[PDB]
């Protein structure tokens, strides 16, 4: 019954990795939601919509790397339902950015508990994997979103009106 | 309250399009499941896994075209939960292909009810849209999967063993 | 017994499409006839013969698209005899052009009854197909032949003699 | 007396298409008017003037496609007077954009009545034509103008003064 | 109230230039009419239709240069209705050419009264403008149309029938 | 009444060549039939369908060379009905190949009687023509089909199931 390729892969880890897969697919669905919002004809911020559409595609690629890992180690993937996003209508460019940042910190929090459970089961390949592909880029994302939120607040979003518009063109529009 | 760009777009259609979006995202999740299965170390059919991974990416692109349509016409997108796939373990290459085909016919059935409701509300742009981008490629998909299922059955899958292996290399491996 | 790929394809349509296939193959045979006539050593209008030979090849390509359609939808093709053309000897360049035009209108008339029967069975993919590939180019053909017949009559074909000759070089000879 | 190429083309449609031609030429004249306004030495928004000049040229190209259609089907074109635009002086960038949008919806409304009259006379080629070349791009225009009006209002046009200026450079100036 | 850029621009000239704009737009509409006529399925002279379509596009470009001039000098543009062309059906290639020539002489006559009114108000820039861009090319047009009318009459249009046909291919078809 | 270019062309030959034209058009229709069969969604052998579609196009080119010959020698072409193929459904890849081979031998048999009748009327150009363009390639076709039938039988078609599938990819799929 155990996989021919299975070696030093504890059950508690296999279960934790399945939960992290469901968490990345759900983040991917949240960015997709926001992207729909900024494409609305009475919000109309195209560069915001392209920005979150890209984040969406990147999160779906994190889920699939984890899907490969779990097959390489001889664990089995058990998919669950992907819950709908907290809300449909996201108010403003600055409110969507602050939720993105809150979301991205929670994904980060779960990877750090994942890493703490692999260190305490003595699984070095799994740890190295999380470190090399997840923890580092998750810290670059948070820092970037932290900077976007800072700039928008300074320019006086959302009360200013010209702030998101200029932000859309200069910072997100390359 | 009604969108500035809204014109000849009945409520019953806006609701139908939201349900079709949830149906494409769910198909996308089912292909993703199958792809995980053929990558398993004790199934090991790489060209099958690449085939369904591509179908997965294509269905997620159908959902996003529909997301654009609904914004262009001034309707609003209301995302629901995406339910987990019927099963986790898909038996064989021929059983996965027969379920793919059964799935793809149900997506087709819902587009034909969508088109019947747009014709009976007199919405010509919505009809043209469904016809030009959905109904045609949905018929090419079904015909292709119908042919794959036919060949596999003839070569004697799944009892033969060499049938999926050869099928994987010649028909799916370009 | 019913095809695995068959869906929303009424028997009355499958029968109508078979009759339209026989009608395109017969048109293809009529153009082939005319082309033989203008190659005759005592008619001798080479650019007329090249013109109808091309129309012949185009009609045989319409029949084969319809042959593909009927297989994609899971209907079955039932070929009949192709009847010989009304006549062997076609008098003149202007008489051959007026028969071509009368022929091309009858092909058009049958596609419009085909489309009226698919709309009344609720088959949207079949309708879109006929519209996108048949009705439009059938209207461009009729308009072109209508213009050729007009010019020839004006220049005084067939009594003039120099009219077809000049027509052969300037309008049909690029 | 009836055209040699005429087939399944009802009189009521020929009359409707003539009225739609006069409607596109009149829209073309309105955009030309606005373009003159933004070139005025005491408005001075060059990128607005280039934007409406282009819309003007596009509408004159819609009228000529319809002029071709009506000749291909063997109807006759009956040109009327083109009435002068509602006003000469258009106040602001945001007021010109809101009138453009109101205009573009009325052109859309007339194409949808045109399509409803071709469906009820059973003219499939005419319907396909309107759908494929008019209804789709008319919906992309409305959505775009809807977005421009939204942005300008948000930035605080016309009271702001810097809003149109920045809008002219970033959104319309490529 | 007077424009900041206005200098040596008499009211009587501003009014004359507005009337010349309406005259070029009306000529543009007349050529458009003729072009529709030669595209008719029972006239069928394609190179005649391309010839007048081009003249149409050129006249619409003369109107827009005048629209720029009037803005550069700080006058205001007051658009009127564009009246429908004298007739719908233009008989023959030679009759359409003789009306084109009569039209083009009347446009010329109005530019010469325009120039006589700018010389008698002492406006040198306006005079130079009319001379450099209008009077010269208006004389080349008349001479060309004069030559086309001469040739057609000689070959025996419209009684000959082969005359317009050959004319269409050799003189207008490059 | 006799053609100006007619020389040493006996009536009995002109009649024989007309019958051979009808025989090539009928072979062309039979290959077209088979090609439709292998494109069926429950046969599904694409490389077989491409193979017979090509043979179809080649036979229609043999008929047209003969149509040219008969015009060059000053005979007249008298087209007959093209009869429908013996059957609609062709069982298997090996059964279709054995009928193709039986068909291709009968075409060969008629060319050899044609050549025997031209030698006994003393028509050397007609003989050379048949020899140089027909008899040689007809012998290469038969030998090829003879080899395909041999291989399929050896691999154990049609009972094997994997035989046609592999044959489709290696021998017919280049
Ligand atoms: Mg991640
Ligand atoms: Mg789809
Ligand atoms: Mg056709
Ligand atoms: Mg339009
Ligand atoms: Mg001029
Ligand atoms: Mg042959």
Residue numbers in the entry:
A (entry chain A), B (entry chain A), C (entry chain A), D (entry chain A), E (entry chain A), F (entry chain A): 1 to 174
What does the paper say about this structure?
Interestingly, most of the reconstructions resolved at a resolution of 2 Å or better correspond to apoferritin from various organisms, as a result of its high symmetry and intrinsic stability. Indeed, apoferritin is now commonly used as a standard sample to assess microscope performance and implement developments in cryo-EM. We show that basic settings for automated cryo-electron microscopy imaging using the Glacios® electron microscope, often thought of as a “screening microscope”, allow structure determination at high resolution.
Standard image processing procedures were performed in Relion 3.0.5 to calculate an electron optical density reconstruction of mouse apoferritin at 2.7 Å. In particular, iterations of particle-based CTF refinement, followed by particle-based polishing and beam-induced motion correction procedures were critical factors in increasing the resolution of the final reconstruction of mouse apoferritin from 3.6 Å to 2.7 Å. The Coulomb potential map clearly resolves densities for all secondary structure elements of apoferritin (helices A-E and Loop L), with the appearance of main chain carbonyl oxygens consistent with the FSC-calculated resolution. The side chain of Arg63, a residue at a two-fold symmetry interface between two protomers, could be built in two orientations. The 2.7 Å 200 kV cryo-EM potential map also revealed density for 72 solvent molecules, compared to an average of 121 +/- 24 water molecules per monomer of the asymmetric unit in the 2.24 Å X-ray crystallographic structure. Two putative cations could also be located (although their identification cannot be determined from the present cryo-EM map alone): an iron ion on the fourfold symmetry axis and a magnesium ion at the ferroxidase site of the monomer. Nevertheless, the densities for negatively charged amino acid residues are consistently lower in the cryo-EM map, a phenomenon that is likely to be more prominent in 200 keV than in 300 keV reconstructions due to increased inelastic scattering.
